[PDB]
Design a protein around this motif. Structure first.
Motif, PDB file in Angstrom:
ATOM      1  N   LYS A 159     -15.202  -4.105  20.826  1.00  0.00           N
ATOM      2  CA  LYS A 159     -14.757  -5.044  21.938  1.00  0.00           C
ATOM      3  C   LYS A 159     -16.008  -4.925  22.896  1.00  0.00           C
ATOM      4  CE  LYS A 159     -11.038  -3.766  23.559  1.00  0.00           C
ATOM      5  NZ  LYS A 159      -9.709  -3.418  23.945  1.00  0.00           N
ATOM      6  N   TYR A 160     -16.492  -3.806  23.266  1.00  0.00           N
ATOM      7  CA  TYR A 160     -17.203  -3.438  24.496  1.00  0.00           C
ATOM      8  C   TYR A 160     -18.753  -3.767  24.167  1.00  0.00           C
ATOM      9  CZ  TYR A 160     -19.334  -1.000  28.448  1.00  0.00           C
ATOM     10  OH  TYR A 160     -19.904  -0.647  29.514  1.00  0.00           O
ATOM     11  N   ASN A 161     -19.236  -3.395  22.863  1.00  0.00           N
ATOM     12  CA  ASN A 161     -20.653  -3.420  23.012  1.00  0.00           C
ATOM     13  C   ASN A 161     -21.175  -4.766  22.239  1.00  0.00           C
ATOM     14  OD1 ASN A 161     -21.574  -0.645  23.854  1.00  0.00           O
ATOM     15  ND2 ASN A 161     -20.035  -0.145  22.130  1.00  0.00           N
ATOM     16  N   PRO A 162     -22.323  -5.284  22.768  1.00  0.00           N
ATOM     17  CA  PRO A 162     -23.037  -6.365  21.920  1.00  0.00           C
ATOM     18  C   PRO A 162     -22.987  -6.197  20.404  1.00  0.00           C
ATOM     19  CG  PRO A 162     -24.033  -6.184  23.658  1.00  0.00           C
ATOM     20  CD  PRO A 162     -23.286  -4.743  23.609  1.00  0.00           C
ATOM     21  N   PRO A 163     -22.632  -7.506  19.798  1.00  0.00           N
ATOM     22  CA  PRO A 163     -22.406  -7.051  18.265  1.00  0.00           C
ATOM     23  C   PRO A 163     -23.624  -6.639  17.400  1.00  0.00           C
ATOM     24  CG  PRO A 163     -22.362  -9.341  18.923  1.00  0.00           C
ATOM     25  CD  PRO A 163     -22.141  -8.661  20.058  1.00  0.00           C
TER      26      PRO A 163
ATOM     27  N   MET B  24     -24.204   2.130  14.277  1.00  0.00           N
ATOM     28  CA  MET B  24     -23.544   3.379  14.091  1.00  0.00           C
ATOM     29  C   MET B  24     -22.063   3.476  13.783  1.00  0.00           C
ATOM     30  SD  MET B  24     -25.995   5.124  16.937  1.00  0.00           S
ATOM     31  CE  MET B  24     -26.260   6.825  16.638  1.00  0.00           C
ATOM     32  N   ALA B  25     -21.510   2.790  14.589  1.00  0.00           N
ATOM     33  CA  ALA B  25     -19.919   2.407  14.577  1.00  0.00           C
ATOM     34  C   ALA B  25     -19.760   2.163  12.985  1.00  0.00           C
ATOM     35  CB  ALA B  25     -19.488   1.748  15.435  1.00  0.00           C
ATOM     36  N   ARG B  26     -20.307   1.047  12.743  1.00  0.00           N
ATOM     37  CA  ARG B  26     -20.027   0.582  11.224  1.00  0.00           C
ATOM     38  C   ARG B  26     -20.435   1.287  10.039  1.00  0.00           C
ATOM     39  NH1 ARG B  26     -17.573  -1.468   9.121  1.00  0.00           N
ATOM     40  NH2 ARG B  26     -18.813  -2.907   7.716  1.00  0.00           N
TER      41      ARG B  26
END
Ligand SMILES: CC(=O)Nc1cc(NC(=O)c2ccc3c(c2)c(-c2ccc(N)cc2C)nn3C)ccc1C
Length: 113
Positions: free
Chosen positions: A84-88, A95-97
């Motif tokens: 939601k917060y960071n540009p895609p 890293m999240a993905r």
């Protein structure tokens, strides 16, 4: 598939997300986002329910998850906050993905709703 066995598998999933092999992309998610160090002062205007692995691990150790799906909801909230917060296209989204791929692969063993 008792709730005990499911909660045991969720503990193993969390241990895997905290494991050494994934540190190179999981480290931004170990602790609350360090807003003050990074200078991300609009973070709390966007994210109203912060979540991180350290918080999830404290809840797991305190026996605070009633089932696997409440654990899954907290893990996914941590990832959704990042998306939601960071540009895609951002590196921390990559890293999240990668960390989410670890979660989703193992969580697939949990019986459905
Ligand atoms: C609304 C808005 O301004 N979006 C935005 C956000 C960025 N992001 C960063 O610059 C950045 C740099 C280093 C970062 C992070 C973010 C995070 C981080 C932040 C939040 C969450 N939930 C999870 C993580 C892991 N960790 N680290 C180490 C850049 C441009 C824009 C326009």
């Amino acid at each position: 598939a008792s709730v005990t066995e499911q909660l045991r598998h969720c503990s193993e999933i969390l241990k895997e997300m905290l494991a050494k092999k994934h540190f190179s992309y999981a480290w931004p998610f170990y602790n609350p986002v360090d807003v003050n160090a990074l200078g991300l002062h609009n973070y709390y205007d966007v994210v109203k329910n912060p979540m991180d692995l350290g918080t999830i691990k404290e809840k797991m150790d305190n026996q605070e998850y009633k089932d696997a799906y409440k654990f899954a909801a907290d893990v996914r909230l941590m990832f959704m906050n990042c998306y939601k917060y960071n540009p895609p296209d951002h590196e921390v989204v990559t890293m999240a993905r990668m960390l989410q791929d670890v979660f989703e692969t193992h969580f697939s063993k949990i019986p459905i709703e």
